[PDB]
């Protein structure tokens, strides 16, 4: 079997609509495990500034309390099965995962029904998890990658709800009560914005019957005919620089607005991200590394790492790279990274295109190996793309990318467009924004 | 379309294995039984340089050729360093399995180990250790294995501070020429059929036949290394000798490990009905993180209690956790909690099973430990055959065994082996 | 007797340190700490183009 | 025969005259990027022996005399020590430019 | 006796001493062996068997008198330098608060006899031990192996 026959022999995604606007989706495979999950289209975009950290508060608070099984009875019923319970939230989509065995899914789907619409919010639990969220937001400042991405989300989008981080500010989480949280739950945890997800050992008739039995009859109608609507967030090309010289390593991230979710430009710029490449100091490739910015980076020892990102939200994207370097090598890293971006936008070779195509193809199948990122992409694709895009169709839109199309779409999005520049270290050898914008266009063109 | 896991032994002493998942990602893992436990005090820390030497110049393929070949085909080459056994895994695109498989074969069976590339990799050893030791827990586990064994498992998995600048190409060639043997290692494959794997095993793999040094039985020592770090959280771990992999007590010790609790099941939850996080939180209002710790090897395992706490109340969490294991050593336990422990262990084994990297690691570990594959349904049967008195006997063996302790942080109230 | 050099002869410079002054993430939460312990032993992964991961 | 060519190579050795100033065949090479990338590869005793021979050639060419006839380096005593490193460096750079061509 | 009973079995260069360090509450007595990495197990076990021979009592009273004269002379080496004399009466006036004469110290060392040496060797060989080691450790014996 080749790649096309292997992706045709990948088992299909079954998606059905329930009676209350719910989406239920399964990928049947031969694993003995099953991950059920619920993905809700609710995050930091769909809340206003009065209730900032309500998504983080509800993803903390949906597990410790339930109207049906109060207190630690969820922990009793979960650890009597062996399920794990991840709960990740982004700026647009939040989730509640589970990870259990395939014989326990009548208990498991009932428990995930009891989590998302029957979560009682006790006020002592509200006060204790308020202290938990303030201590977690104190402990999150030492990790630099999340606060540098939060600084870039603050400085790229201004006056629009992608500025608000998923943690929420300290005043705006100490000013959260029971009635605002159940207003956010009664307005944003709705079954048209909800998809249940399964990844193996699962019959879709079992999911349809069980989600009809337990996790149906969920809302579907807003209260005062107050329907939220999605708005395009205004990308402001700006900069932010939190100079703290006592931290030993500078974390600087440069991004430019990218396509958003539903465009076919996304496969092209993630191909361009594969050509630009990722690095950390534990990478054993050395000087012979195929990424050109990585080979000059370990040739002159400039950075400790760079991660390139295509963070796409609905209608908008951030698209750039987060490098951690020392204090002396920042200007050389901005020069080599904007030179590699401008080389990819100006003169990209077909060998680089097939290298980035193979790296993106390997990363797309290596993400969709496991059952929990199969559930993550089935819930995220059922919320964003409108269906789970099969990996043969991602394979096809990877396969249509060549050097001229990659250079044209890169020259549309990267070439002479205003960056958003964030940094939280020794930020003295960062060039100023006119020098960054002067590096954003080539005089050699 | 997943018909069977083909599993056969070449007559030199090699285990070859392959599974046809009709998988678009092909993962071939070589599994040598040369971890960090098979060296001695003269060749300390050369397993770290052999772990970092995946991209050096080989015979028939250069370092530039192997880096551009692996990340231009598209897949990854990476290692996995358990203290017993090492793994060279390669994932990649199914259309060009052969170049990746001969690339990992040229990594393993015919290296060159040039002196200038080892001198370039000497700084990468220090950089990799200084990044990997930002986790506080791996220093505690390294000090734990340094304390709790006499020789041939007490060697650290990462390199020591002095051997960077001392590991030679003759030392790496001696380690490879002794302990990378076709009669010792195994080669397992996921998504790749048996025919080209047997052809590659006949082609470039069946040369070595001398098994080398087999270790020195890993005699138990017991004691304390108690360093100070300056963090507010002390990290302490109290561990006794338990049974080995393949015995009739390692399954009972793993049922006891999931009975005392070792996993954050509900994330940002209390971890309630685990017994250690029950009995610590009955007495302590301090923030903590208490868990069980099972480290099973082929010679003698290690079962213990892991405590992370604030340094003002380390004695309360450590004595409450050890009093919980002293309570369960007297038989004070419920069979519903033993059934929940058994279901948590069956869930954890299927968590190890469900990813193909984890399935490759499980097939390689079963191939090196046994030589014949054991199915996961029989693993569920062997976990379900653990009696309720066997984990009481395991906690009695943990209590009556000689202790070992590794701790770091502010050590003002951290208790000792006399107090435990 | 009651001295430092009278007890051990050559070991007085190694138990008596002279000094001629002139020339002659911190995990702060219990719920955030769930996962920092050791379930499974030391496993080290060093890749070619993937970063370091420790399986515990 | 080949003895006329060997006599011509010995005459070219004594006419080039870097056997006069204590040097072997590979101490007189132009240290470009390839010769520098090959000159890093030697063991420490051969590297210090090459640098001592280079310093004695620099010293005696500064003093403008030569070593005597016994202290000259013969053609049979010449060792092509840099050649198994320089052939590897040249072949590695040829493979690198082949991958730059591809 | 440590150097004789180590050098009767070992031929490599070494240095075996014993050191005492008595503080105001508790003290340490022990054997400090500097060896090569190959013969250090034979050195440490031969030294420990020599202190076992002292603990069973294989002693010569002329050697005990030579030890008494060695301690009296070494205390006079500590006395005879003025910084050592200042350190001696500084530690005496600091800990004890009274100054014994050095002749009174010589009378105490002459008052110590052989049975106290046998009792202290039995106390050292029967007490709980602690071992600090540094070097190539492939033949260094453990405390349970002693």
UniProtKB/Swiss-Prot annotation, chain A:
The modification Phosphothreonine is found at residue 179. The modification N6-succinyllysine is found at residue 128. Pfam families: Peptidase_M16 (PF00675), Peptidase_M16_C (PF05193). This is Cytochrome b-c1 complex subunit 1, mitochondrial. GO terms for molecular function: metal ion binding; protein-containing complex binding; ubiquitin protein ligase binding. It is found in: Mitochondrion inner membrane. It is a peripheral membrane protein. One of its GO terms (biological process) is response to activity. The gene is Uqcrc1. SUPFAM superfamilies: LuxS/MPP-like metallohydrolase (SSF63411). One of its GO terms (cellular component) is mitochondrial inner membrane.
UniProtKB/Swiss-Prot annotation, chain B:
Signal peptide: none annotated. It is found in: Mitochondrion inner membrane. Gene3D superfamilies: Metalloenzyme, LuxS/M16 peptidase-like. It comes from the Eukaryota. The keyword Transport applies. The modification N6-acetyllysine is found at residues 33, 166, 217. One of its GO terms (molecular function) is protein-containing complex binding. One of its GO terms (cellular component) is respiratory chain complex III. Expressed in neurons and astrocytes of the cerebral cortex and hippocampus (at protein level). One of its GO terms (biological process) is response to xenobiotic stimulus. The modification Phosphoserine is found at residue 335. It is a peripheral membrane protein. Belongs to the peptidase M16 family. UQCRC2/QCR2 subfamily. Component of the ubiquinol-cytochrome c oxidoreductase (cytochrome b-c1 complex, complex III, CIII), a multisubunit enzyme composed of 11 subunits. The complex is composed of 3 respiratory subunits cytochrome b, cytochrome c1 and Rieske protein UQCRFS1, 2 core protein subunits UQCRC1/QCR1 and UQCRC2/QCR2, and 6 low-molecular weight protein subunits UQCRH/QCR6, UQCRB/QCR7, UQCRQ/QCR8, UQCR10/QCR9, UQCR11/QCR10 and subunit 9, the cleavage product of Rieske protein UQCRFS1. This is Cytochrome b-c1 complex subunit 2, mitochondrial. It comes from Mus musculus.
From Swiss-Prot, chain C:
It comes from the Eukaryota. Coiled coil: none annotated. Component of the ubiquinol-cytochrome c oxidoreductase (cytochrome b-c1 complex, complex III, CIII). Subunit 9 corresponds to the mitochondrial targeting sequence (MTS) of Rieske protein UQCRFS1. It is retained after processing and incorporated inside complex III, where it remains bound to the complex and localizes between the 2 core subunits UQCRC1/QCR1 and UQCRC2/QCR2. Component of the ubiquinol-cytochrome c oxidoreductase (cytochrome b-c1 complex, complex III, CIII). UQCRFS1 undergoes proteolytic processing once it is incorporated in the complex III dimer. One of the fragments, called subunit 9, corresponds to its mitochondrial targeting sequence (MTS). The proteolytic processing is necessary for the correct insertion of UQCRFS1 in the complex III dimer, but the persistence of UQCRFS1-derived fragments may prevent newly imported UQCRFS1 to be processed and assembled into complex III and is detrimental for the complex III structure and function. This is Cytochrome b-c1 complex subunit 9. The lineage of its organism: Eukaryota, Metazoa, Chordata, Craniata, Vertebrata. The chain holds residues 1 to 78 of 274 of the full protein.
């Amino acid at each position: 079997a080749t790649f096309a026959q292997a992706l045709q022999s990948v088992p299909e995604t079954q998606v059905s609509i329930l009676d209350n606007g719910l989406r239920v989706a399964s990928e049947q495979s031969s694993h003995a495990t099953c991950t059920v999950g619920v993905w809700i289209d609710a995050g930091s975009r769909y809340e206003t500034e009065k209730n900032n950290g309500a998504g983080y508060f509800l993803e903390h608070l949906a597990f410790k309390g339930t109207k049906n099984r109060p207190g630690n009875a969820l922990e009793k019923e979960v650890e009597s099965i062996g399920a794990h319970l991840n709960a990740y939230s982004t700026r647009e989509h939040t989730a509640y995962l589970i990870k259990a065995l395939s014989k326990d899914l009548p208990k498991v789907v009932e428990l995930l029904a009891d989590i998302v619409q029957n979560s009682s919010l006790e006020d002592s639990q509200i006060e204790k998890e308020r202290d938990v969220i303030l201590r977690e937001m104190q402990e999150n400042d030492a990790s630099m990658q999340n606060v540098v991405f939060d600084y870039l989300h603050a400085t790229a989008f201004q006056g629009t709800p992608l500025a608000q981080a998923v943690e929420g500010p300290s005043e705006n989480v100490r000013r959260l009560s029971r009635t605002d949280l159940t207003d956010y739950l009664n307005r944003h945890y709705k079954a048209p914005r909800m998809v249940l997800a399964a990844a193996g050992g699962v019959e879709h008739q079992q999911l349809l019957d069980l989600a009809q039995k337990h996790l149906s009859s969920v809302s579907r109608v807003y209260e005062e005919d107050a329907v939220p609507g999605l708005t395009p967030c205004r990308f402001t090309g700006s900069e932010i620089r939190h100079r703290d010289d006592a931290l030993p390593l500078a974390h600087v991230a440069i991004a430019v607005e990218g396509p958003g979710w539903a465009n076919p430009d996304n496969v092209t710029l993630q191909v361009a991200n594969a050509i630009i490449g990722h690095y950390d100091c534990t990478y054993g490739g050395g000087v012979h590394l195929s990424s050109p910015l990585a080979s000059v980076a370990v040739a002159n020892k400039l950075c400790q790492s760079f991660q390139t990102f295509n963070i796409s939200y609905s209608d908008t994207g951030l698209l750039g790279a987060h490098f951690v370097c020392d204090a002396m090598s920042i200007d050389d890293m901005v020069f080599f990274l904007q030179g590699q971006w401008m080389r990819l936008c100006t003169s990209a070779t077909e060998s680089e295109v097939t290298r980035g195509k193979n790296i993106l193809r390997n990363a797309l199948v290596s993400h969709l190996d496991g059952t929990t990122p199969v559930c993550e992409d089935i819930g995220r694709s059922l919320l964003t793309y409108g269906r789970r895009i099969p990996l043969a169709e991602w394979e096809s839109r990877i396969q249509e990318v060549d050097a001229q199309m990659l250079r044209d779409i890169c020259s549309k999005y990267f070439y002479d467009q205003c960056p958003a520049v964030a940094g939280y270290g020794p930020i003295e050898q960062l060039p100023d924004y006119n020098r960054i914008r002067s590096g954003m266009f080539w005089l050699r063109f | 379309q997943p018909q069977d896991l083909e599993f056969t032994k070449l007559p030199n002493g090699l285990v070859i294995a392959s599974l046809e998942n009709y998988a678009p990602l092909s993962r071939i893992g070589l599994f040598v039984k040369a971890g960090s436990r098979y060296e001695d005090s003269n060749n300390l820390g050369t397993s770290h340089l052999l772990r970092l030497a995946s991209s050096l110049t080989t015979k028939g393929a250069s370092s530039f050729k192997i880096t551009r070949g692996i990340e231009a085909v598209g897949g990854k080459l990476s290692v996995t360093a358990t203290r017993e056994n090492m793994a060279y895994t390669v994932e990649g695109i199914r259309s060009d399995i052969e170049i990746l498989m001969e690339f990992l074969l040229n990594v393993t069976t015919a290296p060159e180990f040039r002196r200038w590339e080892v001198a370039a990799l000497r700084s990468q050893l220090k950089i990799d250790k200084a990044v990997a030791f930002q986790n506080s827990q791996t220093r505690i586990i390294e000090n734990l294995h340094d304390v709790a064994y006499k020789n041939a498992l007490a060697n650290p998995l990462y390199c020591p501070d002095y051997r960077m600048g001392k590991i030679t190409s003759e030392e790496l060639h001696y380690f490879v020429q002794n302990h990378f043997t076709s009669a010792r290692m195994a080669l397992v494959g996921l998504g790749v059929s048996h025919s080209v794997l047997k052809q590659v095993a006949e082609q470039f793999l069946n040369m070595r036949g001398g098994l080398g040094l087999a270790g020195a039985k890993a005699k138990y020592r017991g004691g304390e290394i108690r360093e100070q770090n300056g963090d507010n959280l002390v990290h302490a771990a109290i561990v006794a000798e338990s049974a080995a992999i393949g015995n009739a007590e390692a399954n009972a010790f793993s049922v006891l490990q999931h009975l005392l609790g070792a996993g954050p099941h509900i994330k940002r939850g209390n971890n309630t009905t685990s017994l250690l996080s029950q009995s610590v939180a009955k007495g302590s209002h301090q923030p903590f993180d208490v868990s069980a710790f099972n480290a099973s090897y082929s010679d003698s395992g290690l079962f213990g209690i892991y405590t992370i706490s604030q340094a003002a109340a380390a004695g309360e969490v450590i004595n409450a956790a050890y009093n919980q294991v002293k309570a369960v050593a007297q038989g004070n336990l419920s069979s519903a909690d033993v059934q929940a422990a058994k279901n948590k262990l069956k869930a954890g084994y299927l968590m190890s099973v469900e990813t193909s990297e984890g399935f490759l690691s499980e097939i390689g570990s079963q191939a090196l430990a046994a030589g014949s594959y054991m199915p996961p349904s029989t693993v569920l049967q062997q976990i379900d055959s653990v009696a309720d008195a066997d984990v009481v006997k395991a906690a009695k063996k943990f209590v009556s065994g000689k202790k070992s302790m590794a701790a770091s942080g502010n050590l003002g109230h951290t208790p000792f082996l006399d107090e435990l | 007797m009651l001295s430092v050099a009278a007890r051990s002869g050559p070991f007085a410079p190694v138990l008596s340190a002279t000094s001629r002054g002139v020339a002659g993430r911190p995990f702060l939460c219990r719920e955030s700490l769930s996962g920092q312990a050791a379930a499974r032993p030391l496993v080290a992964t060093v890749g070619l183009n993937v970063p370091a991961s420790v399986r515990f | 025969s080949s003895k006329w060519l060997d006599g011509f190579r010995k005459w070219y050795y004594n006419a080039a005259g870097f056997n006069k100033l204590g040097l072997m065949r590979d101490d007189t090479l132009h240290e470009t990027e390839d010769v520098k990338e090959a000159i890093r590869r030697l063991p420490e005793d051969l590297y210090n022996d090459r640098m001592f021979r280079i310093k004695r050639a620099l010293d005696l060419t500064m003093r403008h005399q030569i070593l005597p006839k016994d202290q000259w380096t013969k053609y049979e005593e010449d060792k092509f020590y840099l050649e198994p490193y320089l052939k590897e460096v040249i072949r590695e750079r040829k493979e690198r430019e082949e991958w730059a061509k591809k």
